Symmetry: D2
C-alpha cells in the first residue's frame, strides 16, 4: 500500500495551503496513505515579530523519518533564489540516510512559492535529491491551468489562487499514481 509524505516549510501560510492541495490530490489514488508534516523552524521564536503564522497544525518531521515513505513531495518558499534555509537545513541533516542509501529509488517531487525565483528553487532541489538517488517527477503540462510551472506547482506569496491549487492537486495525484505503481 504506498506511503506519501507531503513535507513543507511555510512562514506566512502560502505553502501550507498548497501542501493541503498536494495532499488532497495524492489521496485521490486508491491505496495511497498521505501524511503532511512541516520541517522545524530555524528562526528564534520571537523573531518569527516578522508576522509568521504560528498556528500550523501539521506535525513537525525529523530527517530520520524520510526513510518510512515511498514518495516525498517537498514544499518550500524561495530564499534569495534558492530553497528556504529551513528546508535546506533539514536536507543538510540527511548524511546518515545518504551513506546507507536509505532514500535510493524513492519518488520525489517539489512545489515552491515565489520570493523571486521559483524555478531555480525547484530545479536546485532536484539536483540535491539526485545525490540521494531519488526518482524525480516534474508535472509537465498535464494540468490545463498551465496554459505554476512544468517543474512543479508554485504560488506567488495574498493567498494561493484556485488555478494554483488545481495544479497542486494534479501534482499530488500524478506523483501518487507513479509511487503506487512503483510499489
Amino acid at each position: 500500500m504506498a506511503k506519501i509524505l507531503v513535507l513543507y516549510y511555510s512562514m506566512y501560510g502560502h505553502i501550507e495551503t498548497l501542501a493541503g492541495a498536494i495532499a488532497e490530490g495524492a489521496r485521490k489514488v486508491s491505496g495511497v496513505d498521505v501524511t503532511i508534516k512541516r520541517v522545524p523552524e530555524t528562526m528564534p521564536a520571537e523573531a518569527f515579530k516578522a508576522g509568521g503564522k504560528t498556528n500550523q497544525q501539521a506535525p513537525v518531521a525529523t530527517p530520520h523519518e524520510l526513510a518510512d515513505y515511498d514518495g516525498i513531495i517537498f514544499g518550500t518558499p524561495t530564499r534569495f533564489g534558492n530553497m528556504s534555509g529551513q528546508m535546506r537545513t533539514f536536507l543538510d541533516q540527511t548524511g546518515g540516510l545518504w551513506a546507507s542509501g536509505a532514500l535510493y529509488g524513492k519518488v520525489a517531487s517539489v512545489f515552491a512559492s515565489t520570493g523571486g525565483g521559483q524555478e531555480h528553487t525547484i530545479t536546485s532541489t532536484w539536483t540535491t535529491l539526485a545525490h540521494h538517488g531519488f526518482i524525480i517527477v516534474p508535472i509537465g503540462y498535464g494540468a490545463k491551468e498551465l496554459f505554476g510551472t512544468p517543474y512543479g506547482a508554485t504560488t506567488i506569496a495574498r493567498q494561493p489562487s484556485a488555478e494554483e491549487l488545481a495544479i497542486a492537486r494534479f501534482q499530488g495525484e500524478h506523483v501518487a499514481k507513479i509511487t503506487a505503481k512503483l510499489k
Copy 2:
C-alpha cells in the same frame, strides 16, 4: 479493439544519442547492455541526424561508421523510456540533439511523451560542463512531462577516484580528451551499465 490489443506487453527503451568521435556511441552500447539485463524490456539504439556539413565532419576526423539507425522525432512516442546521450556544447546539450528535440513540438502539443521515463548520459573533452549538460537537459525534458531518473551513488565505481573517471549522480559520463583521443574506461562503462539497468527496472515496473 478486438485484435489490435496485444496479450503481452514489453517496456520499450530507446537509447537515443549523438556522437561525433564515438565516445557517446560506446557509452550508448553499455547503457543498452544494462537495460537488456531486465526481463520484459525491449532495447533499441538510435542516433539523431548530423547537422554539420559532411565535409567539415570528415575533415574534423568524425566517425561516419555508426551502425545505429537514424531516429525520427515522431517515433519517440512509441517508447516507454528514453535514455538520451550527448556530448556537451558549453555546458548544454549538443546542437545536434537540441535540433532533434526542437522537432518534437508536435509531440509536446499532444502530450505524446507525457509520463514516460527519461535519463541522460554525456561526454565532454575535459570534464568541463558535464554535470550541467545533464541537468539542463532535465529541464527541457520536464516540459514534455518526463519522469527524470538520476543514478545517485548506486554504481560503486563512482567512489573510485584513483583514475580519470566520468560518471556523476546525475548520469553516466565519459571524458574524451580535448582532442577526443581518450577511450571510455571500464569503470565509465560499468556506471553506464548500471544506469541502463536502473532505468529499465523503473520503466518495466511502471509498465507492468
Copy 3:
C-alpha cells in the same frame, strides 16, 4: 574608449524594446560606444504566419564579430525553459572564438523575456559564457524597481512596462561602467 554590443533575439518585439533601454543605459556612460544587433532568425521566413515582427531595424550580427566588443549584453526570449533556439544556435557557432580564447575576460550580462522561466534562461546563459571566460555581471537590487530579477532585466511577453524598462536602463549603465573601468 569601450565598446558594448547589445545582442538580442526577438520574435514579437518585447526583447527588442528592452534592448533599446539596455542600450540607452549604457550610452549614459562617457566614452562608451554602444551597438545594437540581432542574431539571425532560424525559422523559415513564411512560418515566422506565426505573427512575427518582421520590421526590426537592428542589423544582423555574425558570431565572428563578438571579438570586436569589450562587453556584450545578451537578450533572449525563453524557449521551454532555456534560451531561445536562435540565440543558442548563434552561441553554438563560437567554437573558433573559444579555441583561440578570443572572448576571454570580456564582460557579459543577460536579459530575458518570460515564456515560463526567465531565471533559468539567464543563469544557464551564464554557465555557457563561463566556458568562454566571460566576466559575468548580475544586477542585484541596484534598481529600486526590484523592490525584473537580480540576475538581469526581464519582461513578461503586451509591451514591457516602464518598471521593466527602468531596470533594463540600470543594467545597461551598470554593465557599461564596469566595462569602461576594465578597459
Copy 4:
C-alpha cells in the same frame, strides 16, 4: 574628510573558506598565492565558524588546527573582492558557508556588497556536484550584486585529463576522496593559483 581619505588605495581580496578536513584550506592558500602576484592587492585569508558540535567534528577526524582567523559577517563589506571556498553539501555550498552568508542580510539590505568582485572554489569527495556547488553559489552572490568571475579555460592544466584532477571553467576544485584521504594535486593548486591571480587583476583594475 580632510584626514580620513587615504593617498593610496589597495584592492582588498578576502579568501573566505570553510574546510573540515583541510582540502579547501590548502586550495585557499594557492588562491591567495595567486592573488599576491598582483601589484597593489592586499590578500587576507579567513574561515567561517564551525556549525557542528566540537565532539562530532573531532570524532569525525576534522582538522581543528586551522590558523586562519574566523571571519565576521559584517567585515565582508571591507573588501573589494571575495573568493569563496567550500566543500559541497549535495551539490550546494556547505551548511557552514550557507549559515555564514545567511548572516549578511544586513549587508544585503544596505547594498554594502554591491558591485564587489566574487569568485568560487569547491571540494567534493568524488567529484559529484562540484560544478553545481559553484554555480548555485553564484546565484546567491547575485542577490548581493556581486560581479561573478569564472575562470574559463585560462589555466591550461584544465586540458590535462591524464590523472584525477579537480578544476572547472566555473572555478577551481579539488577531489578529496569519499574518505578525505586524497591530497590536493599540483595541477589543482596551479588552477587555483590562476584563479586568484585572475580575480585579483580584475579587482585591482576596477579599484585603480
